[PDB]
């Protein structure tokens, strides 16, 4: 879904993922849980309403 492509020098990256229209989807969903399946099996992110 999101492919992070780095240049030949960058080695350490800290990404802040943020859900902006969650207050709108609150009117449509009752529970929604997004797990960002990270690099090689790790799951480093979890977003909800």
């Amino acid at each position: 879904w999101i492919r992070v492509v780095n240049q030949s020098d960058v080695e350490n990256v800290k990404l802040e993922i943020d859900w902006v229209n969650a207050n709108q989807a609150a009117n449509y969903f009752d529970y929604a849980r997004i797990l960002v399946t990270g690099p090689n099996g790790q799951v480093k992110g979890y977003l909800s309403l």
Binding site: N6, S8, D9, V10
Partner: protein, 49 residues
């Protein structure tokens, strides 16, 4: 019959031509070649000469 004015001379010259040093510059283009510098990146760059 002559009253000699007793004064003979010797002379010499000193030649100061150059300035003591030549600071030959070979400037550095540090992103270099076959490398990459990215925004926010951290590292080291080396130029031997």
């Amino acid at each position: 019959s002559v009253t000699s004015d007793r004064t003979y001379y010797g002379y010499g010259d000193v030649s100061v031509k150059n300035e003591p040093v030549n600071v030959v510059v070979s400037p550095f283009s540090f992103p270099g070649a076959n490398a990459s510098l990215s925004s926010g990146g951290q590292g080291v760059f080396k130029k031997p000469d």
